[PDB]
Amino acid sequence: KELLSSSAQREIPDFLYVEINGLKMVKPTDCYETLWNKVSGERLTWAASMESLEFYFKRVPKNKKKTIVVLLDELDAMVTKSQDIMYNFFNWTTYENAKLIVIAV
DNA sequence: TGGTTTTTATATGTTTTGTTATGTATTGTTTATTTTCCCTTGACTGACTGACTGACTGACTGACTGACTGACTGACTGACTGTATATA
């Protein structure tokens, strides 16, 4: 919230929050779905959305792509099988042409 | 140009088959001890059969025996030949 007021400084580059309550989500691949349906409002399945999103991330340069900040909540039950989801996530977090602000709990 | 059909991706459901860990019961492993009848050890027992004692009848040398055969010698009978006798 203090960082929101810092966005209300209008001297830092505007960026956007993402609430992630996987516990207020059913199927833990819906992260990608809701991500696309809130960054675009466009509706797909995870196996299109995350892939279009990698396409959105590394294949896309900086000058128009936006900083986004995201924070994950209670990962102890989210990734219970093999953490391929969160593996994908942390695999997205390793670029130099893409910019993001990631956190978890 | 413009409407319609065909296939595909995502999502879920259905069914069969095969994988892993485990707790309980049976049975094996090692060691010590006693009994059983089969297999060695051996004298007794019963028929056996080798050397010694009897024996029994066919083979070669003792020639034998005795008839018969082989040379010699005289006896005898036939063939040869003289003495003799008779007639022209």
mmCIF file of C-alpha atoms (C1' of nucleotides) in Angstrom:
data_model
loop_
_atom_site.group_PDB
_atom_site.id
_atom_site.type_symbol
_atom_site.label_atom_id
_atom_site.label_comp_id
_atom_site.label_asym_id
_atom_site.label_seq_id
_atom_site.Cartn_x
_atom_site.Cartn_y
_atom_site.Cartn_z
ATOM 1 C CA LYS A 1 0.000 0.000 0.000
ATOM 2 C CA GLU A 2 2.895 2.338 0.714
ATOM 3 C CA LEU A 3 4.221 1.240 -2.664
ATOM 4 C CA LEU A 4 0.829 2.190 -4.133
ATOM 5 C CA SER A 5 1.345 5.680 -2.778
ATOM 6 C CA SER A 6 4.763 5.448 -4.403
ATOM 7 C CA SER A 7 2.962 4.708 -7.659
ATOM 8 C CA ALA A 8 1.031 7.876 -6.752
ATOM 9 C CA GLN A 9 4.411 9.579 -6.805
ATOM 10 C CA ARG A 10 4.256 9.400 -10.619
ATOM 11 C CA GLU A 11 8.046 9.228 -10.674
ATOM 12 C CA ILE A 12 8.442 5.429 -10.591
ATOM 13 C CA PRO A 13 7.323 3.245 -13.518
ATOM 14 C CA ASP A 14 3.731 2.165 -13.027
ATOM 15 C CA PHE A 15 3.277 -1.537 -12.392
ATOM 16 C CA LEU A 16 0.483 -3.807 -11.336
ATOM 17 C CA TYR A 17 -0.345 -6.168 -8.517
ATOM 18 C CA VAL A 18 -1.470 -9.754 -8.767
ATOM 19 C CA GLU A 19 -3.190 -11.495 -5.882
ATOM 20 C CA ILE A 20 -2.582 -15.251 -5.868
ATOM 21 C CA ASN A 21 -4.758 -17.241 -3.483
ATOM 22 C CA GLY A 22 -4.404 -20.728 -4.843
ATOM 23 C CA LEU A 23 -6.536 -21.752 -1.880
ATOM 24 C CA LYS A 24 -9.188 -19.498 -3.343
ATOM 25 C CA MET A 25 -8.500 -21.384 -6.566
ATOM 26 C CA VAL A 26 -9.490 -24.966 -7.316
ATOM 27 C CA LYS A 27 -7.064 -26.442 -9.813
ATOM 28 C CA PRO A 28 -3.533 -25.077 -9.332
ATOM 29 C CA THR A 29 -2.981 -24.634 -13.078
ATOM 30 C CA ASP A 30 -5.745 -21.992 -13.013
ATOM 31 C CA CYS A 31 -3.019 -19.578 -11.946
ATOM 32 C CA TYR A 32 -2.095 -19.218 -15.603
ATOM 33 C CA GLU A 33 -5.753 -18.996 -16.628
ATOM 34 C CA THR A 34 -6.702 -16.208 -14.254
ATOM 35 C CA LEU A 35 -3.398 -14.516 -15.007
ATOM 36 C CA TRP A 36 -4.321 -14.276 -18.650
ATOM 37 C CA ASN A 37 -7.952 -13.416 -17.906
ATOM 38 C CA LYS A 38 -6.767 -10.529 -15.720
ATOM 39 C CA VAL A 39 -3.773 -9.255 -17.724
ATOM 40 C CA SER A 40 -5.823 -9.564 -20.936
ATOM 41 C CA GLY A 41 -9.289 -10.576 -19.893
ATOM 42 C CA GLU A 42 -8.927 -13.395 -22.425
ATOM 43 C CA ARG A 43 -10.108 -16.909 -21.753
ATOM 44 C CA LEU A 44 -8.263 -20.124 -22.495
ATOM 45 C CA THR A 45 -7.022 -23.307 -20.881
ATOM 46 C CA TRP A 46 -3.751 -23.450 -18.995
ATOM 47 C CA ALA A 47 -2.048 -25.391 -21.770
ATOM 48 C CA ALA A 48 -2.622 -22.416 -24.042
ATOM 49 C CA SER A 49 -2.384 -19.668 -21.491
ATOM 50 C CA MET A 50 0.960 -20.404 -19.879
ATOM 51 C CA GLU A 51 2.463 -21.040 -23.279
ATOM 52 C CA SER A 52 1.129 -17.831 -24.732
ATOM 53 C CA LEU A 53 2.506 -16.339 -21.543
ATOM 54 C CA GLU A 54 6.035 -17.593 -22.086
ATOM 55 C CA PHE A 55 5.543 -16.163 -25.528
ATOM 56 C CA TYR A 56 4.467 -12.994 -23.744
ATOM 57 C CA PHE A 57 7.522 -13.005 -21.478
ATOM 58 C CA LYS A 58 10.804 -13.924 -23.096
ATOM 59 C CA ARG A 59 9.898 -13.503 -26.754
ATOM 60 C CA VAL A 60 8.641 -9.965 -25.945
ATOM 61 C CA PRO A 61 11.103 -7.050 -25.482
ATOM 62 C CA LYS A 62 10.998 -4.522 -22.656
ATOM 63 C CA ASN A 63 10.034 -1.118 -24.028
ATOM 64 C CA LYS A 64 6.267 -1.817 -23.942
ATOM 65 C CA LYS A 65 5.938 -4.858 -21.721
ATOM 66 C CA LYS A 66 5.121 -3.808 -18.166
ATOM 67 C CA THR A 67 6.553 -4.586 -14.786
ATOM 68 C CA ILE A 68 4.110 -6.655 -12.803
ATOM 69 C CA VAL A 69 4.399 -7.632 -9.175
ATOM 70 C CA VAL A 70 3.019 -10.879 -7.887
ATOM 71 C CA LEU A 71 2.901 -12.664 -4.488
ATOM 72 C CA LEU A 72 2.060 -16.400 -3.871
ATOM 73 C CA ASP A 73 0.186 -17.467 -0.720
ATOM 74 C CA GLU A 74 0.604 -20.734 1.306
ATOM 75 C CA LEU A 75 2.397 -22.949 -1.212
ATOM 76 C CA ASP A 76 2.299 -26.002 1.104
ATOM 77 C CA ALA A 77 -0.933 -27.334 -0.495
ATOM 78 C CA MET A 78 -0.803 -25.689 -3.926
ATOM 79 C CA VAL A 79 1.850 -27.811 -5.630
ATOM 80 C CA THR A 80 1.279 -31.034 -3.793
ATOM 81 C CA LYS A 81 1.971 -33.476 -6.638
ATOM 82 C CA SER A 82 5.295 -32.563 -8.276
ATOM 83 C CA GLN A 83 5.569 -28.761 -8.315
ATOM 84 C CA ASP A 84 5.626 -28.641 -12.085
ATOM 85 C CA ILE A 85 3.432 -25.537 -11.794
ATOM 86 C CA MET A 86 5.708 -23.675 -9.444
ATOM 87 C CA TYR A 87 8.656 -25.076 -11.348
ATOM 88 C CA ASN A 88 7.245 -23.319 -14.401
ATOM 89 C CA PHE A 89 6.894 -20.182 -12.319
ATOM 90 C CA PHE A 90 10.433 -20.101 -11.032
ATOM 91 C CA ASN A 91 11.534 -20.969 -14.542
ATOM 92 C CA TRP A 92 9.845 -17.769 -15.686
ATOM 93 C CA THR A 93 11.712 -15.849 -13.023
ATOM 94 C CA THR A 94 15.127 -16.177 -14.688
ATOM 95 C CA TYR A 95 15.226 -13.723 -17.574
ATOM 96 C CA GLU A 96 17.015 -10.467 -18.347
ATOM 97 C CA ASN A 97 14.730 -9.222 -21.126
ATOM 98 C CA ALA A 98 11.615 -9.804 -18.986
ATOM 99 C CA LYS A 99 11.003 -7.919 -15.730
ATOM 100 C CA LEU A 100 8.913 -9.065 -12.796
ATOM 101 C CA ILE A 101 8.624 -8.738 -9.038
ATOM 102 C CA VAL A 102 7.892 -12.115 -7.439
ATOM 103 C CA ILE A 103 7.220 -13.183 -3.883
ATOM 104 C CA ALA A 104 5.680 -16.113 -2.028
ATOM 105 C CA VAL A 105 4.559 -17.156 1.435
ATOM 106 C "C1'" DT B 1 -17.963 -13.259 -51.562
ATOM 107 C "C1'" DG B 2 -20.523 -16.220 -47.680
ATOM 108 C "C1'" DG B 3 -22.517 -19.753 -45.122
ATOM 109 C "C1'" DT B 4 -21.481 -24.871 -43.378
ATOM 110 C "C1'" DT B 5 -19.087 -29.050 -42.235
ATOM 111 C "C1'" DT B 6 -15.104 -31.647 -40.442
ATOM 112 C "C1'" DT B 7 -11.482 -32.337 -37.271
ATOM 113 C "C1'" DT B 8 -8.929 -31.361 -32.886
ATOM 114 C "C1'" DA B 9 -7.698 -29.904 -28.068
ATOM 115 C "C1'" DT B 10 -9.084 -30.039 -23.547
ATOM 116 C "C1'" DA B 11 -11.438 -32.273 -20.145
ATOM 117 C "C1'" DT B 12 -13.345 -35.843 -17.945
ATOM 118 C "C1'" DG B 13 -15.016 -40.742 -17.198
ATOM 119 C "C1'" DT B 14 -14.308 -46.151 -17.430
ATOM 120 C "C1'" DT B 15 -11.973 -50.458 -17.022
ATOM 121 C "C1'" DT B 16 -8.285 -53.748 -16.781
ATOM 122 C "C1'" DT B 17 -3.744 -55.032 -15.161
ATOM 123 C "C1'" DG B 18 0.485 -54.874 -12.559
ATOM 124 C "C1'" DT B 19 3.735 -52.966 -8.445
ATOM 125 C "C1'" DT B 20 5.305 -52.681 -3.558
ATOM 126 C "C1'" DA B 21 5.276 -53.281 1.507
ATOM 127 C "C1'" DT B 22 3.923 -55.991 5.328
ATOM 128 C "C1'" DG B 23 2.538 -59.211 9.524
ATOM 129 C "C1'" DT B 24 1.726 -64.073 10.737
ATOM 130 C "C1'" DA B 25 2.468 -69.087 10.363
ATOM 131 C "C1'" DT B 26 5.129 -72.873 8.813
ATOM 132 C "C1'" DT B 27 9.357 -74.925 8.388
ATOM 133 C "C1'" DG B 28 14.421 -75.112 8.205
ATOM 134 C "C1'" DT B 29 19.394 -74.871 10.854
ATOM 135 C "C1'" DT B 30 22.593 -76.145 14.332
ATOM 136 C "C1'" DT B 31 23.760 -79.128 18.162
ATOM 137 C "C1'" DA B 32 23.364 -83.102 21.566
ATOM 138 C "C1'" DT B 33 21.416 -87.986 22.784
ATOM 139 C "C1'" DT B 34 19.357 -92.901 22.369
ATOM 140 C "C1'" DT B 35 17.608 -97.028 19.869
ATOM 141 C "C1'" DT B 36 17.627 -100.731 15.564
ATOM 142 C "C1'" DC B 37 18.415 -104.180 13.144
ATOM 143 C "C1'" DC B 38 21.867 -104.944 8.814
ATOM 144 C "C1'" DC B 39 26.787 -106.441 8.080
ATOM 145 C "C1'" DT B 40 31.418 -108.099 9.853
ATOM 146 C "C1'" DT B 41 33.880 -111.799 12.446
ATOM 147 C "C1'" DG B 42 34.187 -116.666 13.502
ATOM 148 C "C1'" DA B 43 33.855 -121.386 15.034
ATOM 149 C "C1'" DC B 44 30.997 -125.560 13.932
ATOM 150 C "C1'" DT B 45 29.335 -128.927 10.278
ATOM 151 C "C1'" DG B 46 28.799 -131.623 6.448
ATOM 152 C "C1'" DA B 47 30.059 -133.420 1.809
ATOM 153 C "C1'" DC B 48 34.241 -133.625 -1.101
ATOM 154 C "C1'" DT B 49 37.970 -135.718 -3.570
ATOM 155 C "C1'" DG B 50 43.846 -136.310 -4.380
ATOM 156 C "C1'" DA B 51 47.707 -139.835 -3.138
ATOM 157 C "C1'" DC B 52 48.112 -144.480 -1.662
ATOM 158 C "C1'" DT B 53 46.640 -149.263 -2.016
ATOM 159 C "C1'" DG B 54 44.829 -153.340 -5.288
ATOM 160 C "C1'" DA B 55 44.553 -155.463 -10.016
ATOM 161 C "C1'" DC B 56 43.655 -157.232 -14.662
ATOM 162 C "C1'" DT B 57 44.006 -158.253 -19.084
ATOM 163 C "C1'" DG B 58 46.167 -157.235 -23.651
ATOM 164 C "C1'" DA B 59 51.246 -156.949 -26.084
ATOM 165 C "C1'" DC B 60 56.397 -158.491 -28.185
ATOM 166 C "C1'" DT B 61 60.236 -162.149 -27.506
ATOM 167 C "C1'" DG B 62 61.367 -167.605 -25.839
ATOM 168 C "C1'" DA B 63 61.198 -169.368 -30.674
ATOM 169 C "C1'" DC B 64 58.352 -174.267 -31.053
ATOM 170 C "C1'" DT B 65 56.265 -177.549 -33.834
ATOM 171 C "C1'" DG B 66 55.730 -180.203 -37.480
ATOM 172 C "C1'" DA B 67 54.430 -180.774 -42.027
ATOM 173 C "C1'" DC B 68 56.252 -179.839 -46.254
ATOM 174 C "C1'" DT B 69 59.452 -178.776 -49.522
ATOM 175 C "C1'" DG B 70 64.095 -179.186 -51.975
ATOM 176 C "C1'" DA B 71 68.578 -181.570 -53.740
ATOM 177 C "C1'" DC B 72 70.795 -186.147 -54.197
ATOM 178 C "C1'" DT B 73 70.968 -190.652 -55.541
ATOM 179 C "C1'" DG B 74 69.752 -195.252 -57.239
ATOM 180 C "C1'" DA B 75 66.112 -198.160 -59.929
ATOM 181 C "C1'" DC B 76 64.097 -199.017 -63.705
ATOM 182 C "C1'" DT B 77 62.089 -198.975 -68.442
ATOM 183 C "C1'" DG B 78 62.278 -197.441 -73.003
ATOM 184 C "C1'" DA B 79 65.041 -196.428 -77.113
ATOM 185 C "C1'" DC B 80 69.291 -197.488 -79.485
ATOM 186 C "C1'" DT B 81 72.209 -200.653 -81.462
ATOM 187 C "C1'" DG B 82 75.163 -204.851 -82.110
ATOM 188 C "C1'" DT B 83 75.282 -210.182 -82.443
ATOM 189 C "C1'" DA B 84 73.340 -213.210 -84.795
ATOM 190 C "C1'" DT B 85 71.011 -216.324 -88.350
ATOM 191 C "C1'" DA B 86 69.182 -217.716 -92.980
ATOM 192 C "C1'" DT B 87 69.041 -217.937 -98.019
ATOM 193 C "C1'" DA B 88 70.876 -217.337 -102.930
#
